[PDB]
Structure formats: C-alpha cells, structure tokens
C-alpha cells in the first residue's frame, strides 16, 4: 500500500534486478 512499503519493495527489488540483469 503505502509509499513506504512500495519504496522499500521497489528499492531492494529493482536494485537486485538491475545488478542481476546487468551482470547477466
């Protein structure tokens, strides 16, 4: 819901996703 939950959620998510998708 809240901008908090979304923020963290997209944070670590996109973070691990960019690194993983970049180094792939």
């Amino acid at each position: 819901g809240l901008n908090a939950l979304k923020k963290v959620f997209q944070g670590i998510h996109e973070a691990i996703k960019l690194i993983n998708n970049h180094v792939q």
Side-chain angles (χ1 to χ4, degrees):
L2 280 78
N3 287 64
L5 197 157
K6 297 298 304 300
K7 172 166 64 246
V8 54
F9 187 72
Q10 294 182 283
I12 81 293
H13 181 212
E14 204 202 62
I16 68 179
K17 283 291 97 95
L18 287 177
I19 189 173
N20 284 328
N21 295 349
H22 175 220
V23 303
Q24 165 160 49

